[PDB]
Every structure is written in structure tokens, then in C-alpha cells.
Structure 1
């Protein structure tokens, strides 16, 4: 299309002359090996082509061939049960071509061109189509994978392929303006997929953890951010969300973390079972992995490919989760490509437009009515890892102004193994005032007042922690020692949850309502007994708070009979005093 030669090489930087008329953010091919570069900062007749592999062995004067089209994913049937990298190339075909290392510049296609799919059509000839109307249907891993008209593409249908078995290259619809419509379509990643309307959130993203569903909920069309220092437990939390949530598809985006944690996800998932379907669990997850040493300027593309795949599965009526980990590695990738632009940096070396990039990424969520007539959602869980363990960073202070449901993981609750290590003194969730009618219909009737009782009692506990760190555990009254001990058994029997035990990994909220009603009945009858007046040491040695402490290791299956027995013993253990 447009030709040039390499002028200068520096790491992830190829400044290239001879290119006048090239456009910004359009994908070039660098060198004779055909590396995949993207243009930033074109001037004169040059272009600062950054590259998505390692330039190590490139000489100057090698040709640079532009294309004039931006970074296009290929969106169609076949992305499920798949591992991709930051330019959407399937890593399994790269494994089959190369050895066990990933050599630069090998080209493969993001969808199989030789697997035959089952096309069942749902449009008659002479029918009108707009961008977003469904055309046919392909069954895929038990899902009913629709096939969309590409947006901005309009017209009248001339002819349709019959019900059969065809490949993703076969033109399944031929319109009246000569335009064929295939099973897939290319799409630039830096554009939000156009949509009909954004709704308001009234349904929770059920994590399966007790604290992050009771105290800090996330609505289905909402963002969420979970920071913490290294050793807190971000990644095991996000794999638990990928393993036990009520989402149709889960786009797990490894944006600059280790590869061992991704081999773990590829191995321990196909044994497991999707709860909403009956099938396996790797049959619903799309997995975009750009590891630590896989090259640095591909992380921006790897964080956009995941979100446009999640928007594609939003446009089919599904209900998508996205888990993007270590977005400060994406900010550091922007800093490292900024380091050779020699453009003037903001606080701590980051480029100035970082907050605008984070905003225009996190605003691609949110429970829409699509152009096809159905509703969908993308909910984003972003892990923001600060460098010094300090949340005054320019990345974290630009994340926590646009996310709802911000979740600080501390390290002092993580030294003692208290998982998940959600700090309660500084984490917040704003969706508690639009999930009230959903709770009051689908969990219980007194569930917001019971959640507020828990939060008010934990606030009194963390108020009295001043006095217990200053004066001592004694020189305190019996009622406030009751408050401290009940807060401690809340944090040990309702908040703490280990994600490796067979029981107590997935905890649906009937069990969480049960545990909170146990603890609040214990607290109310204990404070009534302690204002009647008994000793506290003959309260705190009952065989019923051991029942509460083991009430989270019992199964979901027989749970309400156990809850009835716990309530009967919780009146019959203060009957005796």
C-alpha cells in the first residue's frame, strides 16, 4: 500500500521514513520478517512505528509496508475455548507450528478456516437488515451462538444459504447491494461497538464469595476494581470469580502477569463444570494471555482485544464478565513506549493521557439494550497493582474515581492467612441502593436491614479498636467486650473463606443470609442476657458459637435444616441462663 524503509531502531521503536500519507494507528509490517507494528507520531515523511515483537536482529533499510487499516480483531464463531495473545493469534496453532517457544512474526488466523459449523438461518429473502439484526444460528459448545450483521452495514437481503454445514469463509447472506455477509467481521478495537441504549443496574454479579456479595456487591452492568500489594491474593480471587460466577462468558485478560498462573487456568478448568449449563468450564471462557516476557508494547492491544471480544458477546444477548489483571502493567507499557517518544511525562513518568485511556476503557461496560433487540451486559473487574503497596499512585487514583465497587486488599490481613483479604476500613461499594428490590425479592425480606446490622456492628468494632489498642482488652465493659468478640467471630465465620476447600468455595446467598441471621440472633440475645447480667466468660464458652464457626463448612445441599437446628439451639442455649 505505502512503502518505506527503517530509519532508526531502538527496542520497541522503529522510526521509519519514506512514509507520507500513512495514517495513525494503522498496522504496518516491519522488516522482511513481517513484524506487526503500529504507527504513532508521524511527522514530515516519517512514522514512529512501535512494534509488537522484539526487534533484535533488524537492520536499517529493511522495508516497512503500511496497510491503512487499524487494529482489527476478527469477531465470529470460534473464539470460545480459546487462548489468544495480544494481536488475537491462537497460541495453540503457534504451538503446533513452532516448538515450545514463541518465535516472532509467525502469522495464523484468529478463527479456524476449516472447521465446518452448522448454519440454521432465520431470515427470509427480500427482508430488511440493519447493523445488529441476527441472521442465523450456529450451535457451539451448547451455546446458541448467533451471527450478527456487522454494524453500519445495512440493506435488503437478496439470497440466503440453506440450512447446512458451512465454514466461516462462506458468504451466508448476499445482500441487494452486492455485499456478502460472512460468519465473521473485522472490527477496530478502539471503538465502542454501537448500541441502542444503556440501562440502569438492577441485578447483581454473583461472585460466590460472601463478603463480595453481601457487604460489597457488584451490579451486573457495573465496573469493579480490586487493588492490593503482591502477596495479597488478587489473582486467586479473580480466578475464583472466573470459576464460580453467574456469567455466560468470561473473558480473562492476562495483561502482563506470569504465565504459570495461566497454564494453571488452562489445566484446572476443563475438569470443572459450568454451573448455569451442565457442560465443562473451559467451554465458556475466552482467554487472552500476554505474559510477562512476551513483548511489552502488545499489552495495550491485549487490553483492547479482550474488551472488544466481551462487547461482541454483549451484542448476542449474553451476560459477560471480564477480568483484566494488573492494569498498572498496561500503564507501565504506555510509559515505556512513551520513553522513546521523548514526550513530556506526568506524575512518576506516566504519559498524561493515561487517565483518558483508563476512562475510555472502563466506560465500555454496563448493561445495554443492544441493536438486535436483546439486553446484555459486560462487567469489568480490573486488578490495579500499585508499585510500592501504596494506593496514592496516579493509576489507582485515576481508577477509583471511575470505578464503583472498589476493593482494597491489605497485606497485614494477608500475612496471617485470612482469605480473601478484603480491607473493610477503606473499601466501598455504591450499588447497594439499586440492589434493594432484587434482594427483597430473591433472598429474603429483611436482607438490607440485616446487611446494615452487620455493617453497623463492624463499624462499632472498628471504632472500639482504638480503645483496645490503647488501654488494653481489660478496662472495658462487658457490652463492649461483647461487641469486640462478636465482630471477631463475624470476621472469622462470615468474612473468611478459603478458595480451595470443596465446600465453601461457591456460597450462594441463601447460606450467607443464614449465617448473618445466626450471628445477629446470637448478638441480640447475648446483649439482652448481658444487660440482664451474666458473666461474659460463661457466654463465650458455649457449644453454639462453635456451631456458628463450623456453619460455613457445611454444604449448601442440606443447609436449611441445619439452619433451623442452629436457630433452635440458639434459643435453647440462652434459655438455660
Structure 2
């Protein structure tokens, strides 16, 4: 039982506290505001309070909880909204019955009143169970039809008693583990520190791709189920829109939408839009909120909660990976996580290193990003999970020289750079093709050879065409496009068509909200075939002006290929592109 000796804002300094440990949650103030000890200068212990410090006096009691920042992993978190810590916003609103968030409210992270259906696994009484093993399967939602009740890691022993199949709550004990003499009891849920990576048996090389839906991403700069991506760009540029596109339409079996340093209306829009959309991943179409978790931390919440929400989201995604679900966490404003870190460092007084950011920014970002990757969860039965980290970065002023942008760029494998010039012209997704890259093409060659063999060649051809046309456009701006070669004009026209009808899609329009892998491959083949036909016909001797005048119909058909609706299914859409290739081949004869 300590006492506040200083407040000076969000960072209280409680005195007469011996035995404290770093990043230990104390209960500051009479309202039991939670905190995290971040400097122990002897008896005193600097504490970053996760709530609004306004009224804390010198002499209020501070007590040490005896546990680092821990989330309540378990069934009950598949449609809820969580604050920077793990506090159900719906439960807070239903309990306090107020439009605001009550200060220091203590609501359990999981609903203890919901009776969860339980069905025991292959493990029986007397068997030797290891941490991470499965001993149950709780039916949570229609989409999450089997929430495996994992035995907590770093907790093993011999099963002494297991509950039979029935409806249990989150507080009723389900398993009794003998362990080394001390018979522990395990309920449905289990806590786990957020800054400690969840154990895995062995991480693997992520192979299957994360189908973002966006043509630019999924074609030129692909991501894999388990990869780390960044989407840096100034305010605007569509970082949040790309994030929500991968949140709505993706191949992931679960998703944690972290919103650190994000507008409250962004979370409101997510909560209003997600229940409308449906996916057929399960047997029948089910709402998105049955497989989406929101760690929503608005920008006005304390910077400590901004720091904590990233780790809470990543550890929830790690839990759902340990269950064997291909998760794709989408962090929003990792630059705002870095800004919260910078503010905390400034309040502490630590010397900033790069552009005001703390020196350990790179270490923190690496520790957060390394939690990703496909991995086999420890314990039996074996099952493979994945945590794709699609984190959005918002560098100050739109310059990619920011310290957070540089650290994230060095750490991650994919980079969907956005350009303010393209964003302002409403050329969304506004991907800066020159700078954007993906290091997962070498891995994805295998999947492409399996599914769409011509995809890597077409992607390389389009990248070469875009680079050549960028060089030609620079030369045109330099020299007034005087007596340009016929092939050069062909490349310029084809690349302009590609930029205006393949790299530009309205993510909110019904037809181009989601471009599947098959549709984008067919469109890529159509564009490449059009370019090749123009090249061959002009090399035969045809003038490019007359050829364009004659093939304007084919060009308009290739343009309308973006208007082709993917809702018709593969059979209808693939046949439609078959006619386009036939029409394109017909113009070659003429």
C-alpha cells in the first residue's frame, strides 16, 4: 500500500512502494485507476496511469496487483469492443448506462453470465497434458463453431478431473491438473501477459497468400497468411480504407482490428458496417462481426492505453493462431502507437533519439512485428495458425523518412506505400508503385504454380511495363513527346489504361469493392494480351493511331472488365473474360 507522491499528468510517481516490478499493474487512487510501473527509483515508482488522472491527490493509496498487463483470453471475445486495455465497451455502456466511459470502471473482460456449450476433447482423466494442448471445443458463433479451450502455456501436469459435455460459464472450473503436487484448476478462460509472446512449437514459412481483394495489393505486392505489411502515408491516402477492405474481405478465419490512435467515428463506422456484410467461409453466409474483434482505442484515450492496445490485439491474434485459425490482425496508426511512446518518453524525461521519438522505438516495433508468422501451436493435436499483421503507419507530413516509418520498413516484409498526389486525385488505393514492394513473391511462386501458373510471369510483365512507361513519361515531360516511337506510345497507352482501370478501384463501389484472385488474374491476362496484341500488330507494320481507332471497342471492353461483377461466380466471370480474349484475338486478324 503505497501513496502518490507526484502526478504531473498521466505519469504518477507513487512513493513508499518496495518490491515493485517493471510493467506491474498497480491500482492508483481511491477509484482504483489501473497503471503500469515503468521506473522504480528506489522507494518511489513512476506509474503510467491508463485512465484520466484528474483529482488524484498526494496521499491516495496505491496498491500492487501482482501481475503484468494480462488479457482474458477465452471464449466470449468474438464480437465485443475493447478499450486500450481489455474492457468491454458494450458491457460498460450496459452497466454504467452512460454515453461516456466511467473513470476507473472494473468490468470483466469476458462475460461471466453467458453459458457456453462445452464438449471435451480427446484428452481423458489421468492423461498427461502439456501447455497449449486442447481439452475442449466451445461453440461460440456460427463462424467460430469450435473455440478450442487451450490449456494455458507454461502450465502442464496430469489431468485429474475433466468436466463432461454441457453448458458452462466462464467462471466454472472445467479441468483439474495435478501438476507437481499442487492441483491447479483451469476454467474456460485464461490470462496471459501482453508483452510476452505466446509460445509456439516452431514457426513456419508463410506460403498461402492473404487475399486482400485490392487488385494492386493482391497482384503486384502480395501478402501471405502470416506476413507483416505496412501501409505508410499521410492523413488520407486510404490507409484506413485498405485496412477495412482487408477486414471485410479476406481469407483469414479470424481478425483483430486494433484502432490505437484512431478516430471514434472510425470504430463507429466499423461497428455499423461489419454486421451488414457476409462471407461464405463457413457453410452459410454469416455476419463479419461473428469473426471480428475490435480493440478500439479512440485517440482521446490516454497514451498508455494507445500503447497497450497494440499488444492486446496482437496477443488476441496470437491466441487465435494457437487455436489454429489463420488470423490477420490489422493495426491502425502504428505511427500513433509510436506517438504515444514518444509522449510517454517525454513525460518520463528520457532523451529522444530520432525526430523526438524514443531510442527504443525500433526495438518495440520489432518485438511487436515478430509476433507474426505461420506457426504450429505447441501441444497436441497439431494445428497451424497464422497472424498477418497489416499495420497502418501515418508519418508526420507524409515523408517516408520518419523514424517510425524507417523502423517499420526495415522490420516488415511488405510495404504498400501511398502517395498524397495520387490520393488527392482520388486515384485510390493510391499505391505508390515505384516504392512499394513485396518480399513474399519468391515464396508465393509455389502457390501460383499450383493455382494460377501464369500469375508470376504476368505480374513481372506488368511491373516491367509500368517501370518502362514511367521512364518514358519522364522523358516525355523532358522533351515534349516529339516523334515518340510507336512501341513507346503503345507502352504509354497500355500503362495509362492499367493505371486508370486496374490500379484504380473504388473500394466502396459494389462492383469493385472486392476483386477476387481469379478475377484479378483474368484482368491481368486481358491487359497483357491487349498489350502484346498491340505490340505484335504494330511490329507487323500497322500504325498505332489507326490501330487505336480500330480497337477502341476492345479497349473499352478491357476497361469495362473492371466493371464486371465478381458476384456472378467464377464460372460466369471466367467465361466473360474468355470472350474478351476471343474479341482481342479477333482484332489481331483485322
Correspondence for 1:124? 124
Task: Determine whether 1:491 maps to 2:499.
Answer: yes
Correspondence for 2:100? 101
Q: How does 1:273-292 map to 2 (within 5 A)?
A: 273-277=278-282, 278-292=285-299
Mapped partners of 1:53, 1:157: distance in 2: 41
Mapped partners of 1:108, 1:180: distance in 2: 23
Following TM superposition, by how much is the alpha carbon of 1:370 offset from its aligned partner in structure 2, in angstroms?
0.9
SS in 1 for 2:158: strand
Correspondence for 2:585? 571
SS in 1 for 2:207: coil
Correspondence for 2:82? 84
Following TM superposition, by how much is the alpha carbon of 1:44 offset from its aligned partner in structure 2, in angstroms?
2.0
Deviations 1:369-408, CA, capped at 9 Å, x for gaps: 1113111110101111001110111111111011011111
**Per residue, is there more helix in 1 or in 2?**
2
Match of 1:433 among 435, 438, 442: 442
Q: How does 1:274-353 map to 2 (within 5 A)?
A: 274-277=279-282, 278-353=285-360
Deviations 1:319-370, CA, capped at 9 Å, x for gaps: 0001101111111111111112212221222111111000000000000011
Deviations 1:143-186, CA, capped at 9 Å, x for gaps: 21100111111111111111111111111111234211111111
Correspondence for 1:18? 16
Mapped partners of 1:13, 1:221: distance in 2: 36
Correspondence for 1:408? 417
Correspondence for 1:551? 561
Correspondence for 1:206? 211
SS in 2 for 1:158: strand
Task: Tell me, yes or no, if the aligned pair for 2:458 and 2:525 is still in contact at 8 Å.
Answer: yes
Following TM superposition, by how much is the alpha carbon of 1:474 offset from its aligned partner in structure 2, in angstroms?
3.5
Task: Determine whether 1:255 maps to 2:264.
Answer: no
Correspondence for 2:488? 480
SS in 1 for 2:244: helix
**Would you say how many aligned residue pairs link Structure 1 and Structure 2?**
573
Correspondence for 1:239? 244
Deviations 1:74-94, CA, capped at 9 Å, x for gaps: 111011011001110000111
Task: Tell me, yes or no, if the aligned pair for 2:226 and 2:328 is still in contact at 8 Å.
Answer: no
Correspondence for 1:112? 111
Mapped partners of 1:428, 1:40: distance in 2: 38
Mapped partners of 1:202, 1:339: distance in 2: 42
Mapped partners of 2:575, 2:346: distance in 1: 63
Structure 1 gaps, min length 5: none
Correspondence for 1:154? 156
Mapped partners of 1:510, 1:37: distance in 2: 50
Correspondence for 1:188? 193
Mapped partners of 1:358, 1:506: distance in 2: 30
Correspondence for 2:169? 167
Mapped partners of 2:311, 2:528: distance in 1: 46
Mapped partners of 1:343, 1:507: distance in 2: 48
Match of 2:400 among 391, 396, 417: 391
SS in 2 for 1:377: strand
Mapped partners of 1:366, 1:380: distance in 2: 9
SS in 1 for 2:364: helix
Deviations 1:261-301, CA, capped at 9 Å, x for gaps: 11000011111112312211111000001101112221111
Deviates more, 1:472-481 or 1:142-151: 472-481
Mapped partners of 2:365, 2:20: distance in 1: 27
Mapped partners of 2:368, 2:268: distance in 1: 27
Mapped partners of 1:394, 1:184: distance in 2: 39
Task: Tell me, yes or no, if the aligned pair for 2:36 and 2:48 is still in contact at 8 Å.
Answer: yes
Match of 2:38 among 37, 40, 46: 40
Mapped partners of 2:371, 2:244: distance in 1: 22
Task: Tell me, yes or no, if the aligned pair for 2:303 and 2:341 is still in contact at 8 Å.
Answer: no
Following TM superposition, by how much is the alpha carbon of 1:533 offset from its aligned partner in structure 2, in angstroms?
2.1
Mapped partners of 1:84, 1:232: distance in 2: 27
Following TM superposition, by how much is the alpha carbon of 1:447 offset from its aligned partner in structure 2, in angstroms?
2.0
Mapped partners of 2:526, 2:199: distance in 1: 48
Correspondence for 2:373? 366
Following TM superposition, by how much is the alpha carbon of 1:59 offset from its aligned partner in structure 2, in angstroms?
1.4
Mapped partners of 1:138, 1:256: distance in 2: 33
Following TM superposition, by how much is the alpha carbon of 1:97 offset from its aligned partner in structure 2, in angstroms?
2.4
Following TM superposition, by how much is the alpha carbon of 1:502 offset from its aligned partner in structure 2, in angstroms?
1.1
Following TM superposition, by how much is the alpha carbon of 1:201 offset from its aligned partner in structure 2, in angstroms?
2.1
Following TM superposition, by how much is the alpha carbon of 1:535 offset from its aligned partner in structure 2, in angstroms?
2.5
Q: Which TM-score applies when normalising by structure 1? A: 0.98
SS in 2 for 1:538: helix
Following TM superposition, by how much is the alpha carbon of 1:555 offset from its aligned partner in structure 2, in angstroms?
1.9
Following TM superposition, by how much is the alpha carbon of 1:473 offset from its aligned partner in structure 2, in angstroms?
3.1
SS in 1 for 2:577: helix
